């Protein structure tokens, strides 16, 4: 293990990882990034109708 500042076997990510439970994926909107997109769109909507 060549890791220096992190424990071995550990790979850090900047995004929450939720392992998939099925092998036949379908569209889903309960996502970390989907929430971000929805919030941004809603903020823009609140801006335009101010």
């Amino acid at each position: 293990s060549a890791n220096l500042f992190t424990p071995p076997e550990v790979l850090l990510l900047p995004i929450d990882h939720q392992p998939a439970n099925v092998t036949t994926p379908t569209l889903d909107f309960t996502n970390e990034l989907t929430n971000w997109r929805a919030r941004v769109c809603e903020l823009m909507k609140n801006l335009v109708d101010n």
């Binding site: 036949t24 569209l27 889903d28």
Partner: peptide, 8 residues
């Protein structure tokens, strides 16, 4: 369940 979801 997780297979026959709303997007099938």
């Amino acid at each position: 369940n997780q297979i026959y979801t709303q997007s099938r």
